Structures are given as C-alpha cells and as structure tokens.
Amino acid sequence: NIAVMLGHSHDVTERELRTLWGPEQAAGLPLDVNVVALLMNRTDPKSLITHVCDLMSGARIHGLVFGDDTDQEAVAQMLDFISSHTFVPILGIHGGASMI
Amino acid sequence: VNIGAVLSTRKHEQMFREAVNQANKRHASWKIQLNATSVTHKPNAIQMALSVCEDLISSQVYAILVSHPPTPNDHFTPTPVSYTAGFYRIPVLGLTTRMSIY
Amino acid sequence: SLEARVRDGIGILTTAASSMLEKFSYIPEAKASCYGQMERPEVPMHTLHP
Amino acid sequence: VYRAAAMLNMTGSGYVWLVGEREISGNALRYAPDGILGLQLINGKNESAHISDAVGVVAQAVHELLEKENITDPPRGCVGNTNIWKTGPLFKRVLMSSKYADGVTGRVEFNEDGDRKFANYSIMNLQRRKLVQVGIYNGTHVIPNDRKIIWPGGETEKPRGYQMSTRLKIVTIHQEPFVYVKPTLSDGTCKEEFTVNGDPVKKV
C-alpha cells in the first residue's frame, strides 16, 4: 500500500533518498507498508492515464502522493477526474497539483 | 483545417458531413482543405478521454463539437472532452448539455 | 523542502489507514480494472473521508 | 415534493405553482397537480439546427482568425507535447465576438460567461393532462396568448397572494410607568379595576 510519484523536473532530489523509510517511524500499532515510488517527466494526459492505471494494477489498497513541476493548472482537474472513477486517494504537494 | 467533432450517432455524423460540405460550398479553406472527423461515445469515461485525445489531437483539430448522447443524463458526457481539451487551450462546443456546473 | 511534504503525506495516509482499521477492522482493495471495467458505481466500503 | 404537496392540501383555490424544465417530464408528470406552469424550451432537443449554427459560427471565426499576427499549428499526438499553443486563447477571443447573423435559429450571440444569449423560450401549461402553448419569449419581454390560464383549482380569475394572516404576536417588556406586570388571580382572570375618576381599566 501507499505509492509515491515524482520525476524531478527541476531539482534532482529524488530516488533512493525518499525510497526508504516512509511510514516506518516508531508507531505503536502500524501495519504492513511499502514506499514503492516511480519516476516521470513533463506531464501528458494519456501518459498520466497510463501511469496511474499501471500503478492501480500494481497496487492493492495504495493511495498516491503524486506531485509535479509543470506550471499548468489543468493537472489538478485531470487528477480529480482520475480520482473520480478510480477510488484511489491522491494528495497534491508541489507544482501543478498545488493550484487549488 | 480540421474541425473533427464527437457526435451521438452515425446519422449525426452524416449530417455533420453534409453540413461541412455545405459550408465548403459557401466558403473555402486553403490549408489541408476543411475535412472533419467523427467519433461516438463509450460507456467508460477513461476510454472516451484517451480516444478523444488520440483522435482529435493527432489530427491537429482547431475546435470540436460535443453532444449529449441518448443516455438519460449521465452527468458525465462532455466532461472528459472538456478536461482533455482544457489541458490545452483548444475550445469545445456543447450542442445540448444544459447544466450550470459548466 | 519537498522531503517534509512527502513525509507528511505518507504519515497522513498511514494514519488514515490506521483509523480505518480501528473503525472497520477490514481494508478492501481498489484494483479491479482500469481499461474497460464497466463494473459498478461506488460502494460505501472504505470511504475514508471521515 | 409533488406527492407531499398534494397530501398537505397545498394545491387548489390559490397557491399558483411554478415548475422548471425538469419538473414536468417523465415520472414527474405522473405525480403533479394541474395548473402548473411547466416552462420549457422551443426546439431545444433538436440538434440539426444547432449543428448548422455551430459549423457556421466556426467557419466565421476561422475566417476572422486567419488575418492576425501569427497562427501556429495546434499540438498533435497529446503524448509528446506539454506546452499549450500560443494562439489558444486568441481562438476563444475571436469566437466570443461572433454575432453570426447567418443562422437558422436566430442571431447567435455568445455571452462572455460562455452561455448563449437571446434564447426564445416557450411557456407551457397543463390542464387535465396534455400541454398547451401560452406564450413566446423574445428577450426581456414576455407575451401571453389569447388563452385563459386555468389556475390550479379551476378559478378562472387570477388568484392573488395576500392574506397578512390578521394575527399578530406582540412582544413587550416589564417597565415601571408604561406597562405593568402583576400576578394573575388564582381563579384565572383579571377583574376588580376602577380608575380614580371612575372607569374600567382595560387589561389583557
């Protein structure tokens, strides 16, 4: 469960730095967790569809913490559409998934 | 120019072809002529979105027309086209989808 | 920076999952089908908004 | 809500109803008091006229558009591109300002909000089932026909909406010289009052 999407358009701070740890911490009653993360590039609509569908195929009850660096605000609407008929939670963090 | 549009039925596609023939009779277009394209609706919205992307965008359209299918108010007929064309700035034209959310 | 944001998001998702387990003792899946599913509308199984 | 209103005696001899487009269609007709004014739209469901008007206005917009500073090709593939084309909002700008007189539905004028202005509506009314036309809307002016609106209850005269209920709930406050407050009599009534000069004292 739980997945992370990145791609580091401007800053190259990604990969193994955020791959490990995650929700381990020192929680009293945690559960089986994973920090499976991928990489991407400048957003494309069909590319977004394919990537999210592949993640859903490879995930059981995972959510999403997707982010982006493009300045186009349509990413938020497209991701809301994705969340509509998929029932996989996502949270926006940076860039495109930040124009509320 | 390409003004390919998504229609409810094939008869509407033939009507659109007749309309574009009439328009080309009253005017002209000196850029790849003025041929159009047509496509129907699909029950799955994701399939519709990917289809309209790969069809209209690959044809380099200048606009598009979207109509409500005979489906009894699914509330999601024009939205995938709207979002896909909203990633860019290409306008869309609604035929009969009267709703205040739009 | 972004590291704090991703850490906070991961913690939020984990806490929501823990609350769902404490309130339902059962976490379903969301991996039915993407392309050509046409299965059914939503169900109130794991509506994690509350 | 129609069933509830019919239950609670809300229809009949007054209470003129007013129902939108999605209130006199389908199952709504099964449960509906007569006399409703079911406003609808003329030629709304037809699409051939809409298709012709749309293609005409698109051709007009293109013909106005090619004479500009510079127009580039729209993005293609939607898989190898990420940036919008520069002439995107220009197409919207020219398309909004399109008073295409060449049309089969009328003078096509687009409001800046993105909707269509100057739409010809059509009043409708139901009298013991079936619909009858009553008027035509042409823009900021409604005109009725020569017909008589059979109101919900059979009263040919137009029912007014003024009653005022003729029953006021009045609130006061204890004060020394203006309005007094004394304990009620154990019997449950007020009496035994006489003025200095001799007269009854009115009390509530």
Swiss-Prot record, chain C:
Location in the cell: Cell projection, Dendritic spine; Cell membrane; Synapse; Postsynaptic cell membrane
UniProt remark on domains: Contains an N-terminal domain, a ligand-binding domain and a transmembrane domain. Agonist binding to the extracellular ligand-binding domains triggers channel gating. A hydrophobic region that gives rise to the prediction of a transmembrane span does not cross the membrane, but is part of a discontinuously helical region that dips into the membrane and is probably part of the pore and of the selectivity filter.
Protein family (similarity comment): Belongs to the glutamate-gated ion channel (TC 1.A.10.1) family. NR2A/GRIN2A subfamily.
UniProt subunit comment: Heterotetramer. Forms heterotetrameric channels composed of two GluN1/zeta subunits (GRIN1), and two identical GluN2/epsilon subunits (GRIN2A, GRIN2B, GRIN2C or GRIN2D) or GluN3 subunits (GRIN3A or GRIN3B) (in vitro). Can also form heterotetrameric channels that contain at least two GluN1 subunits and at least two different GluN2 subunits (or a combination of one GluN2 and one GluN3 subunits) (in vitro). In vivo, the subunit composition may depend on the expression levels of the different subunits. Found in a complex with GRIN1, GRIN3A and PPP2CB. Found in a complex with GRIN1 and GRIN3B.
Disease with which this protein is associated in UniProt: Epilepsy, focal, with speech disorder and with or without impaired intellectual development: An autosomal dominant, highly variable neurologic disorder. Features range from severe early-onset seizures associated with delayed psychomotor development, persistent speech difficulties, and intellectual disability to a more benign entity characterized by childhood onset of mild or asymptomatic seizures associated with transient speech difficulties followed by remission of seizures in adolescence and normal psychomotor development.
Function according to Swiss-Prot or TrEMBL: Component of N-methyl-D-aspartate (NMDA) receptors (NMDARs) that function as heterotetrameric, ligand-gated cation channels with high calcium permeability and voltage-dependent block by Mg(2+). NMDARs participate in synaptic plasticity for learning and memory formation by contributing to the slow phase of excitatory postsynaptic current, long-term synaptic potentiation, and learning.
Protein name as annotated: Glutamate receptor ionotropic, NMDA 2A
Native organism: Homo sapiens
Gene: GRIN2A
Residues of the full protein shown: 287 to 336 of 1464
From Swiss-Prot, chain D:
Coiled-coil blocks: none
Subcellular location: Cell membrane; Postsynaptic cell membrane; Postsynaptic density membrane; Synaptic cell membrane
Post-translational note: NMDA is probably regulated by C-terminal phosphorylation of an isoform of GRIN1 by PKC. Its phosphorylated state is influenced by the formation of the NMDAR-PPP2CB complex and the NMDAR channel activity.
Outcome, altering residue 76 to Q: Found in a patient with schizophrenia; uncertain significance
Residues linked to a glycan: 9, 46, 70, 120, 138
Family: Belongs to the glutamate-gated ion channel (TC 1.A.10.1) family. NR1/GRIN1 subfamily.
Protein purpose: Component of N-methyl-D-aspartate (NMDA) receptors (NMDARs) that function as heterotetrameric, ligand-gated cation channels with high calcium permeability and voltage-dependent block by Mg(2+). NMDARs participate in synaptic plasticity for learning and memory formation by contributing to the long-term potentiation (LTP). Channel activation requires binding of the neurotransmitter L-glutamate to the GluN2 subunit, glycine or D-serine binding to the GluN1 subunit, plus membrane depolarization to eliminate channel inhibition by Mg(2+).
Domain notes: A hydrophobic region that gives rise to the prediction of a transmembrane span does not cross the membrane, but is part of a discontinuously helical region that dips into the membrane and is probably part of the pore and of the selectivity filter.
Disorder: Neurodevelopmental disorder with or without hyperkinetic movements and seizures, autosomal dominant: An autosomal dominant neurodevelopmental disorder characterized by severe intellectual disability and developmental delay, absent speech, muscular hypotonia, dyskinesia, and hyperkinetic movements. Cortical blindness, cerebral atrophy, and seizures are present in some patients. Neurodevelopmental disorder with or without hyperkinetic movements and seizures, autosomal recessive: An autosomal recessive neurodevelopmental disorder characterized by severe intellectual disability and psychomotor developmental delay, involuntary and stereotypic movements, spasticity, and inability to walk without support. Intractable seizures manifest in some patients.
Protein name listed in UniProt: Glutamate receptor ionotropic, NMDA 1
Organism name: Homo sapiens
